[PDB]
Amino acid sequence: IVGGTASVRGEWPWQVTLHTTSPTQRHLCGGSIIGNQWILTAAHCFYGVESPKILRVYSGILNQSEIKEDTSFFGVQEIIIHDQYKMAESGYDIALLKLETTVGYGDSQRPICLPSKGDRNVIYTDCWVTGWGYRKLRDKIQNTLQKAKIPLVTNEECQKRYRGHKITHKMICAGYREGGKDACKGDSGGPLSCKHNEVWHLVGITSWGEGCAQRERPGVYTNVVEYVDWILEKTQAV
Ligand SMILES: NC[C@H]1CC[C@H](C(=O)N[C@@H](Cc2ccccc2)c2cc(-c3ccc4[nH]nc(O)c4c3)ccn2)CC1
């Protein structure tokens, strides 16, 4: 996160750090708890990941330093990538991780609500992007979870900022015209959380952008409301 501040412990209890074990243990992406055995993240996080065996999901973490070999984690049973996904820039950048065990809900870990179909018309004015990603283009993964309040931008406005790309309605953008606050490397897969009627909703999944917090280059996110039926399809399978 560029231009953000340290989160308070338990502030984003749906936020997870997805670690890889191959070749060495490192943070790979962010993600969101959406169900007791379900993590919602970005499909691009899995480039070259040949097996769910190498993945470790850590919930209830504020600081990366809390993670040692003795730290409990959730194993991944299945990686479910949208079947239309080719690359982040073309959309369908959404994936589900089915966990091997159930997340026990509490004050350190709980799910975020998905947007409602009727809420495609609501205007979100209180949106926050979180993660352990870089604070500048060339940096390192941050210890403490960072947060930044970002205004949502219309698809028309986002399309002007991305000449040569096709900003679809399955994408949602967020940023300040002058830059300064944005998601950066290592934040991808994480949430874009919006509070409306005292309830937080998973509005976006950090996906892509041209650089980090640049003027007239808003962050591009998977528009979660457009995938509620695909999520229910995969999570509510008989
Ligand atoms: N302004 C809007 C934003 C939107 C989000 C974008 C983003 O985050 N893209 C991802 C794409 C990806 C590539 C490979 C794996 C997973 C995701 C990314 C992540 C990293 C990364 C990840 C883990 C790491 N661990 N240690 C590291 O140093 C480190 C660096 C580096 C480079 N790109 C940046 C622009």
Side-chain angles (χ1 to χ4, degrees), residues 1-68 70-116 118-119 122-177 179-238:
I1 305 287
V2 185
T5 57
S7 290
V8 182
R9 188 179 294 277
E11 210 176 348
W12 314 100
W14 47 87
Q15 174 91 59
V16 304
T17 172
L18 209 219
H19 281 222
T20 195
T21 242
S22 178
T24 47
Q25 223 203 288
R26 67 160 210 171
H27 163 90
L28 177 68
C29 275
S32 305
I33 305 169
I34 62 154
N36 69 3
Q37 68 180 353
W38 302 104
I39 305 300
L40 194 67
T41 189
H44 77 257
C45 293
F46 313 97
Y47 181 81
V49 166
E50 295 307 303
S51 169
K53 313 293 136 61
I54 68 159
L55 302 179
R56 290 183 173 198
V57 170
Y58 296 94
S59 57
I61 269 111
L62 170 64
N63 292 302
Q64 287 291 331
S65 58
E66 295 177 46
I67 308 160
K68 282 172 132 276
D70 67 359
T71 305
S72 71
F73 63 90
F74 296 92
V76 176
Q77 195 174 94
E78 202 193 350
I79 300 160
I80 309 167
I81 285 150
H82 199 290
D83 70 35
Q84 282 177 275
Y85 171 78
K86 290 213 249 204
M87 55 206 294
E89 298 162 284
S90 290
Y92 307 99
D93 195 17
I94 189 163
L96 280 158
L97 298 176
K98 192 185 183 199
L99 305 177
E100 278 166 354
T101 57
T102 279
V103 173
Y105 297 161
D107 299 297
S108 69
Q109 52 196 39
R110 53 206 168 76
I112 183 167
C113 296
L114 289 170
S116 309
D119 282 5
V122 309
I123 317 129
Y124 297 100
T125 189
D126 189 14
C127 299
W128 295 76
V129 65
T130 54
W132 289 274
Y134 291 18
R135 291 161 308 177
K136 50 198 242 281
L137 212 58
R138 58 184 295 128
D139 201 15
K140 60 165 84 73
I141 290 303
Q142 299 306 292
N143 188 42
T144 311
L145 184 60
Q146 308 285 120
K147 53 167 176 187
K149 189 181 189 156
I150 320 285
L152 254 34
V153 142
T154 66
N155 234 252
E156 190 185 357
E157 168 64 9
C158 187
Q159 180 63 79
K160 294 191 207 309
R161 306 310 168 218
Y162 287 102
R163 190 176 189 239
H165 283 94
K166 175 60 189 175
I167 309 299
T168 65
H169 277 101
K170 284 190 163 64
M171 292 169 187
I172 199 172
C173 315
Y176 295 88
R177 202 192 190 269
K181 286 172 163 73
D182 202 0
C184 201
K185 300 171 172 210
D187 293 317
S188 81
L192 171 69
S193 313
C194 306
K195 194 187 184 75
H196 164 250
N197 297 339
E198 292 301 289
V199 45
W200 291 92
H201 292 96
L202 186 50
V203 165
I205 303 165
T206 304
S207 184
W208 66 280
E210 186 48 60
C212 299
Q214 298 198 95
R215 168 189 189 163
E216 290 159 63
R217 291 297 200 164
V220 191
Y221 299 81
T222 306
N223 188 12
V224 180
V225 76
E226 295 305 311
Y227 296 94
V228 167
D229 292 340
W230 176 89
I231 297 165
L232 293 175
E233 174 193 352
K234 307 295 179 177
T235 70
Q236 313 297 291
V238 305

PDB file of all heavy atoms in Angstrom, residues 27 38 48 62 65 68-71 80 84 86 103 105 114 132 156 164 169 179 182 184 189 214 227 231 238, unseen atoms left out:
ATOM      1  N   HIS A  27       5.228 -14.253   1.594  1.00  0.00           N
ATOM      2  CA  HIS A  27       3.886 -13.749   1.332  1.00  0.00           C
ATOM      3  C   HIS A  27       3.774 -13.738  -0.204  1.00  0.00           C
ATOM      4  O   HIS A  27       4.705 -13.270  -0.886  1.00  0.00           O
ATOM      5  CB  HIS A  27       3.742 -12.316   1.876  1.00  0.00           C
ATOM      6  CG  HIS A  27       2.566 -11.545   1.328  1.00  0.00           C
ATOM      7  ND1 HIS A  27       1.323 -11.576   1.953  1.00  0.00           N
ATOM      8  CD2 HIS A  27       2.503 -10.690   0.273  1.00  0.00           C
ATOM      9  CE1 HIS A  27       0.547 -10.777   1.246  1.00  0.00           C
ATOM     10  NE2 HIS A  27       1.208 -10.225   0.217  1.00  0.00           N
ATOM     11  N   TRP A  38     -13.733 -20.803   2.929  1.00  0.00           N
ATOM     12  CA  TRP A  38     -13.526 -20.073   1.670  1.00  0.00           C
ATOM     13  C   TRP A  38     -12.764 -18.755   1.749  1.00  0.00           C
ATOM     14  O   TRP A  38     -13.145 -17.830   2.479  1.00  0.00           O
ATOM     15  CB  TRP A  38     -14.877 -19.853   0.953  1.00  0.00           C
ATOM     16  CG  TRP A  38     -15.629 -21.121   0.629  1.00  0.00           C
ATOM     17  CD1 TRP A  38     -16.718 -21.620   1.285  1.00  0.00           C
ATOM     18  CD2 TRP A  38     -15.364 -22.027  -0.459  1.00  0.00           C
ATOM     19  NE1 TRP A  38     -17.125 -22.800   0.700  1.00  0.00           N
ATOM     20  CE2 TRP A  38     -16.319 -23.067  -0.380  1.00  0.00           C
ATOM     21  CE3 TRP A  38     -14.411 -22.054  -1.501  1.00  0.00           C
ATOM     22  CZ2 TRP A  38     -16.358 -24.124  -1.306  1.00  0.00           C
ATOM     23  CZ3 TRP A  38     -14.449 -23.096  -2.418  1.00  0.00           C
ATOM     24  CH2 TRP A  38     -15.423 -24.111  -2.325  1.00  0.00           C
ATOM     25  N   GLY A  48       2.058 -20.147 -12.321  1.00  0.00           N
ATOM     26  CA  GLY A  48       3.106 -21.119 -12.020  1.00  0.00           C
ATOM     27  C   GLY A  48       2.914 -21.981 -10.771  1.00  0.00           C
ATOM     28  O   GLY A  48       3.748 -22.863 -10.528  1.00  0.00           O
ATOM     29  N   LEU A  62      -1.779  -9.388  12.133  1.00  0.00           N
ATOM     30  CA  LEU A  62      -1.562  -7.976  11.903  1.00  0.00           C
ATOM     31  C   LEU A  62      -0.169  -7.843  11.274  1.00  0.00           C
ATOM     32  O   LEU A  62      -0.012  -7.186  10.239  1.00  0.00           O
ATOM     33  CB  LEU A  62      -1.671  -7.127  13.198  1.00  0.00           C
ATOM     34  CG  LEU A  62      -1.227  -5.651  13.076  1.00  0.00           C
ATOM     35  CD1 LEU A  62      -2.117  -4.849  12.102  1.00  0.00           C
ATOM     36  CD2 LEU A  62      -1.085  -4.970  14.460  1.00  0.00           C
ATOM     37  N   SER A  65       5.711 -10.688  11.044  1.00  0.00           N
ATOM     38  CA  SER A  65       6.611 -11.257  12.071  1.00  0.00           C
ATOM     39  C   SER A  65       5.934 -12.275  13.024  1.00  0.00           C
ATOM     40  O   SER A  65       6.643 -13.069  13.653  1.00  0.00           O
ATOM     41  CB  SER A  65       7.298 -10.148  12.863  1.00  0.00           C
ATOM     42  OG  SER A  65       6.357  -9.298  13.497  1.00  0.00           O
ATOM     43  N   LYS A  68       5.837 -17.768  12.105  1.00  0.00           N
ATOM     44  CA  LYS A  68       7.016 -18.585  12.290  1.00  0.00           C
ATOM     45  C   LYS A  68       6.575 -19.989  11.894  1.00  0.00           C
ATOM     46  O   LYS A  68       5.406 -20.176  11.548  1.00  0.00           O
ATOM     47  CB  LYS A  68       7.478 -18.543  13.758  1.00  0.00           C
ATOM     48  CG  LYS A  68       8.238 -17.284  14.152  1.00  0.00           C
ATOM     49  CD  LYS A  68       8.450 -17.285  15.667  1.00  0.00           C
ATOM     50  CE  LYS A  68       9.870 -16.983  16.077  1.00  0.00           C
ATOM     51  NZ  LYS A  68      10.725 -18.197  16.049  1.00  0.00           N
ATOM     52  N   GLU A  69       7.490 -20.977  11.943  1.00  0.00           N
ATOM     53  CA  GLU A  69       7.187 -22.374  11.614  1.00  0.00           C
ATOM     54  C   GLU A  69       6.130 -22.986  12.529  1.00  0.00           C
ATOM     55  O   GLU A  69       5.392 -23.861  12.087  1.00  0.00           O
ATOM     56  CB  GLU A  69       8.479 -23.220  11.615  1.00  0.00           C
ATOM     57  N   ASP A  70       6.025 -22.509  13.786  1.00  0.00           N
ATOM     58  CA  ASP A  70       5.062 -23.008  14.785  1.00  0.00           C
ATOM     59  C   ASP A  70       3.699 -22.273  14.720  1.00  0.00           C
ATOM     60  O   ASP A  70       2.809 -22.585  15.514  1.00  0.00           O
ATOM     61  CB  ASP A  70       5.673 -22.909  16.209  1.00  0.00           C
ATOM     62  CG  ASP A  70       5.922 -21.492  16.737  1.00  0.00           C
ATOM     63  OD1 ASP A  70       5.640 -20.515  15.999  1.00  0.00           O
ATOM     64  OD2 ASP A  70       6.404 -21.361  17.882  1.00  0.00           O
ATOM     65  N   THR A  71       3.551 -21.271  13.813  1.00  0.00           N
ATOM     66  CA  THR A  71       2.301 -20.516  13.668  1.00  0.00           C
ATOM     67  C   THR A  71       1.288 -21.367  12.948  1.00  0.00           C
ATOM     68  O   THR A  71       1.596 -21.929  11.899  1.00  0.00           O
ATOM     69  CB  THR A  71       2.516 -19.150  12.988  1.00  0.00           C
ATOM     70  OG1 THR A  71       3.511 -18.451  13.724  1.00  0.00           O
ATOM     71  CG2 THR A  71       1.213 -18.280  12.951  1.00  0.00           C
ATOM     72  N   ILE A  80      -9.653 -22.823  -7.036  1.00  0.00           N
ATOM     73  CA  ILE A  80     -10.680 -22.688  -8.065  1.00  0.00           C
ATOM     74  C   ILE A  80     -10.492 -21.329  -8.757  1.00  0.00           C
ATOM     75  O   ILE A  80     -10.786 -20.298  -8.171  1.00  0.00           O
ATOM     76  CB  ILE A  80     -12.144 -22.867  -7.538  1.00  0.00           C
ATOM     77  CG1 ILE A  80     -12.329 -24.162  -6.696  1.00  0.00           C
ATOM     78  CG2 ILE A  80     -13.173 -22.771  -8.709  1.00  0.00           C
ATOM     79  CD1 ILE A  80     -13.715 -24.183  -5.876  1.00  0.00           C
ATOM     80  N   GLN A  84     -12.764 -18.475 -17.399  1.00  0.00           N
ATOM     81  CA  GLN A  84     -12.624 -17.478 -18.469  1.00  0.00           C
ATOM     82  C   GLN A  84     -11.381 -16.637 -18.264  1.00  0.00           C
ATOM     83  O   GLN A  84     -11.039 -15.859 -19.138  1.00  0.00           O
ATOM     84  CB  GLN A  84     -13.854 -16.557 -18.542  1.00  0.00           C
ATOM     85  CG  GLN A  84     -15.021 -17.221 -19.236  1.00  0.00           C
ATOM     86  CD  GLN A  84     -16.208 -16.335 -19.234  1.00  0.00           C
ATOM     87  OE1 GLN A  84     -16.978 -16.295 -18.269  1.00  0.00           O
ATOM     88  NE2 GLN A  84     -16.350 -15.560 -20.286  1.00  0.00           N
ATOM     89  N   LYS A  86      -7.704 -15.323 -18.276  1.00  0.00           N
ATOM     90  CA  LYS A  86      -6.495 -15.410 -19.100  1.00  0.00           C
ATOM     91  C   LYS A  86      -5.396 -14.601 -18.424  1.00  0.00           C
ATOM     92  O   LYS A  86      -4.297 -15.109 -18.217  1.00  0.00           O
ATOM     93  CB  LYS A  86      -6.717 -14.890 -20.533  1.00  0.00           C
ATOM     94  CG  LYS A  86      -7.603 -15.808 -21.365  1.00  0.00           C
ATOM     95  CD  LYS A  86      -7.226 -15.827 -22.852  1.00  0.00           C
ATOM     96  CE  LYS A  86      -8.267 -15.177 -23.731  1.00  0.00           C
ATOM     97  NZ  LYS A  86      -8.196 -15.673 -25.132  1.00  0.00           N
ATOM     98  N   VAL A 103     -12.525 -22.343   9.450  1.00  0.00           N
ATOM     99  CA  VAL A 103     -12.099 -21.155  10.176  1.00  0.00           C
ATOM    100  C   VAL A 103     -13.086 -20.981  11.332  1.00  0.00           C
ATOM    101  O   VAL A 103     -14.293 -20.860  11.091  1.00  0.00           O
ATOM    102  CB  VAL A 103     -12.116 -19.863   9.291  1.00  0.00           C
ATOM    103  CG1 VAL A 103     -11.828 -18.610  10.126  1.00  0.00           C
ATOM    104  CG2 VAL A 103     -11.162 -19.962   8.105  1.00  0.00           C
ATOM    105  N   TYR A 105     -14.712 -18.586  13.679  1.00  0.00           N
ATOM    106  CA  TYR A 105     -14.933 -17.138  13.737  1.00  0.00           C
ATOM    107  C   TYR A 105     -14.748 -16.564  15.151  1.00  0.00           C
ATOM    108  O   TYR A 105     -15.118 -17.197  16.146  1.00  0.00           O
ATOM    109  CB  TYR A 105     -16.329 -16.763  13.212  1.00  0.00           C
ATOM    110  CG  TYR A 105     -16.587 -17.079  11.756  1.00  0.00           C
ATOM    111  CD1 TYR A 105     -17.888 -17.151  11.261  1.00  0.00           C
ATOM    112  CD2 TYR A 105     -15.532 -17.270  10.861  1.00  0.00           C
ATOM    113  CE1 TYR A 105     -18.135 -17.455   9.924  1.00  0.00           C
ATOM    114  CE2 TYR A 105     -15.767 -17.575   9.523  1.00  0.00           C
ATOM    115  CZ  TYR A 105     -17.073 -17.666   9.059  1.00  0.00           C
ATOM    116  OH  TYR A 105     -17.317 -17.905   7.734  1.00  0.00           O
ATOM    117  N   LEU A 114     -20.476 -10.252   0.972  1.00  0.00           N
ATOM    118  CA  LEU A 114     -20.343 -10.045  -0.450  1.00  0.00           C
ATOM    119  C   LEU A 114     -21.363  -8.965  -0.791  1.00  0.00           C
ATOM    120  O   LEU A 114     -22.284  -8.766  -0.002  1.00  0.00           O
ATOM    121  CB  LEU A 114     -20.636 -11.363  -1.198  1.00  0.00           C
ATOM    122  CG  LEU A 114     -19.539 -12.430  -1.035  1.00  0.00           C
ATOM    123  CD1 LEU A 114     -19.989 -13.766  -1.589  1.00  0.00           C
ATOM    124  CD2 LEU A 114     -18.215 -11.977  -1.666  1.00  0.00           C
ATOM    125  N   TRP A 132      -0.119  -6.011   2.759  1.00  0.00           N
ATOM    126  CA  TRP A 132       1.278  -6.020   3.207  1.00  0.00           C
ATOM    127  C   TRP A 132       2.222  -5.664   2.036  1.00  0.00           C
ATOM    128  O   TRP A 132       3.423  -5.804   2.162  1.00  0.00           O
ATOM    129  CB  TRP A 132       1.642  -7.401   3.782  1.00  0.00           C
ATOM    130  CG  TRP A 132       0.999  -7.699   5.102  1.00  0.00           C
ATOM    131  CD1 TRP A 132       1.466  -7.356   6.340  1.00  0.00           C
ATOM    132  CD2 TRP A 132      -0.237  -8.395   5.316  1.00  0.00           C
ATOM    133  NE1 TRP A 132       0.592  -7.787   7.311  1.00  0.00           N
ATOM    134  CE2 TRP A 132      -0.452  -8.445   6.712  1.00  0.00           C
ATOM    135  CE3 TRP A 132      -1.168  -9.021   4.460  1.00  0.00           C
ATOM    136  CZ2 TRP A 132      -1.571  -9.075   7.276  1.00  0.00           C
ATOM    137  CZ3 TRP A 132      -2.286  -9.627   5.020  1.00  0.00           C
ATOM    138  CH2 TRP A 132      -2.481  -9.650   6.409  1.00  0.00           C
ATOM    139  N   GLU A 156     -16.267   4.961 -16.894  1.00  0.00           N
ATOM    140  CA  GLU A 156     -15.992   5.960 -17.951  1.00  0.00           C
ATOM    141  C   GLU A 156     -14.709   6.735 -17.672  1.00  0.00           C
ATOM    142  O   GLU A 156     -13.895   6.917 -18.567  1.00  0.00           O
ATOM    143  CB  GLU A 156     -17.171   6.934 -18.108  1.00  0.00           C
ATOM    144  CG  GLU A 156     -17.052   7.835 -19.330  1.00  0.00           C
ATOM    145  CD  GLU A 156     -18.109   8.911 -19.520  1.00  0.00           C
ATOM    146  OE1 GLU A 156     -19.065   8.979 -18.711  1.00  0.00           O
ATOM    147  OE2 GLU A 156     -17.982   9.681 -20.498  1.00  0.00           O
ATOM    148  N   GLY A 164      -5.808   2.102 -24.502  1.00  0.00           N
ATOM    149  CA  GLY A 164      -5.163   0.891 -24.981  1.00  0.00           C
ATOM    150  C   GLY A 164      -5.655  -0.348 -24.280  1.00  0.00           C
ATOM    151  O   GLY A 164      -5.360  -1.458 -24.729  1.00  0.00           O
ATOM    152  N   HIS A 169     -17.216  -3.759 -17.337  1.00  0.00           N
ATOM    153  CA  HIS A 169     -18.071  -3.536 -16.166  1.00  0.00           C
ATOM    154  C   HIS A 169     -17.835  -4.560 -15.048  1.00  0.00           C
ATOM    155  O   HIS A 169     -18.276  -4.349 -13.908  1.00  0.00           O
ATOM    156  CB  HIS A 169     -19.540  -3.355 -16.551  1.00  0.00           C
ATOM    157  CG  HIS A 169     -19.833  -1.947 -16.981  1.00  0.00           C
ATOM    158  ND1 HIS A 169     -19.927  -1.604 -18.324  1.00  0.00           N
ATOM    159  CD2 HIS A 169     -19.967  -0.824 -16.229  1.00  0.00           C
ATOM    160  CE1 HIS A 169     -20.134  -0.294 -18.341  1.00  0.00           C
ATOM    161  NE2 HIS A 169     -20.164   0.217 -17.106  1.00  0.00           N
ATOM    162  N   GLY A 179      -3.049  10.941  -7.553  1.00  0.00           N
ATOM    163  CA  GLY A 179      -2.346   9.777  -7.028  1.00  0.00           C
ATOM    164  C   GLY A 179      -2.087   9.910  -5.543  1.00  0.00           C
ATOM    165  O   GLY A 179      -2.854  10.559  -4.836  1.00  0.00           O
ATOM    166  N   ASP A 182      -2.697   4.194  -2.994  1.00  0.00           N
ATOM    167  CA  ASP A 182      -3.061   3.070  -3.881  1.00  0.00           C
ATOM    168  C   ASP A 182      -2.560   1.736  -3.333  1.00  0.00           C
ATOM    169  O   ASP A 182      -1.734   1.692  -2.436  1.00  0.00           O
ATOM    170  CB  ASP A 182      -2.353   3.269  -5.255  1.00  0.00           C
ATOM    171  CG  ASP A 182      -2.929   2.559  -6.481  1.00  0.00           C
ATOM    172  OD1 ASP A 182      -3.958   1.837  -6.335  1.00  0.00           O
ATOM    173  OD2 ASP A 182      -2.381   2.762  -7.593  1.00  0.00           O
ATOM    174  N   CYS A 184      -0.226  -1.580  -4.118  1.00  0.00           N
ATOM    175  CA  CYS A 184       1.037  -1.757  -4.806  1.00  0.00           C
ATOM    176  C   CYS A 184       1.410  -3.249  -4.782  1.00  0.00           C
ATOM    177  O   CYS A 184       0.598  -4.067  -4.347  1.00  0.00           O
ATOM    178  CB  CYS A 184       2.134  -0.852  -4.242  1.00  0.00           C
ATOM    179  SG  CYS A 184       3.522  -0.572  -5.381  1.00  0.00           S
ATOM    180  N   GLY A 189      -5.013  -9.560  -4.769  1.00  0.00           N
ATOM    181  CA  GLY A 189      -5.836 -10.623  -4.202  1.00  0.00           C
ATOM    182  C   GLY A 189      -6.565 -10.174  -2.953  1.00  0.00           C
ATOM    183  O   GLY A 189      -7.528 -10.811  -2.518  1.00  0.00           O
ATOM    184  N   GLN A 214       0.156   6.473  -9.068  1.00  0.00           N
ATOM    185  CA  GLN A 214       0.521   7.506 -10.034  1.00  0.00           C
ATOM    186  C   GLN A 214      -0.706   8.339 -10.323  1.00  0.00           C
ATOM    187  O   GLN A 214      -1.831   7.855 -10.244  1.00  0.00           O
ATOM    188  CB  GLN A 214       1.048   6.901 -11.345  1.00  0.00           C
ATOM    189  CG  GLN A 214       2.316   6.081 -11.185  1.00  0.00           C
ATOM    190  CD  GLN A 214       2.998   5.902 -12.514  1.00  0.00           C
ATOM    191  OE1 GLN A 214       3.903   6.650 -12.872  1.00  0.00           O
ATOM    192  NE2 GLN A 214       2.537   4.958 -13.302  1.00  0.00           N
ATOM    193  N   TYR A 227     -19.653 -11.074  -9.781  1.00  0.00           N
ATOM    194  CA  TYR A 227     -19.274 -12.478  -9.630  1.00  0.00           C
ATOM    195  C   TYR A 227     -19.965 -13.196  -8.481  1.00  0.00           C
ATOM    196  O   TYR A 227     -19.601 -14.330  -8.197  1.00  0.00           O
ATOM    197  CB  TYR A 227     -17.754 -12.615  -9.501  1.00  0.00           C
ATOM    198  CG  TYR A 227     -16.993 -12.171 -10.730  1.00  0.00           C
ATOM    199  CD1 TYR A 227     -16.494 -10.876 -10.834  1.00  0.00           C
ATOM    200  CD2 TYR A 227     -16.694 -13.070 -11.752  1.00  0.00           C
ATOM    201  CE1 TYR A 227     -15.775 -10.467 -11.957  1.00  0.00           C
ATOM    202  CE2 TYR A 227     -15.983 -12.669 -12.879  1.00  0.00           C
ATOM    203  CZ  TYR A 227     -15.504 -11.373 -12.964  1.00  0.00           C
ATOM    204  OH  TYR A 227     -14.816 -10.975 -14.078  1.00  0.00           O
ATOM    205  N   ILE A 231     -19.501 -17.068  -7.432  1.00  0.00           N
ATOM    206  CA  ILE A 231     -19.040 -17.453  -6.081  1.00  0.00           C
ATOM    207  C   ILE A 231     -20.021 -18.456  -5.476  1.00  0.00           C
ATOM    208  O   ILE A 231     -19.593 -19.506  -4.989  1.00  0.00           O
ATOM    209  CB  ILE A 231     -18.824 -16.222  -5.154  1.00  0.00           C
ATOM    210  CG1 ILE A 231     -17.703 -15.299  -5.687  1.00  0.00           C
ATOM    211  CG2 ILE A 231     -18.545 -16.675  -3.685  1.00  0.00           C
ATOM    212  CD1 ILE A 231     -17.654 -13.869  -5.048  1.00  0.00           C
ATOM    213  N   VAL A 238     -23.884 -28.645  -4.924  1.00  0.00           N
ATOM    214  CA  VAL A 238     -24.530 -29.785  -4.263  1.00  0.00           C
ATOM    215  C   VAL A 238     -23.690 -31.075  -4.250  1.00  0.00           C
ATOM    216  O   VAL A 238     -22.663 -31.161  -4.921  1.00  0.00           O
ATOM    217  CB  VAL A 238     -26.007 -30.003  -4.702  1.00  0.00           C
ATOM    218  CG1 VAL A 238     -26.832 -28.743  -4.493  1.00  0.00           C
ATOM    219  CG2 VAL A 238     -26.104 -30.476  -6.141  1.00  0.00           C
TER     220      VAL A 238
END
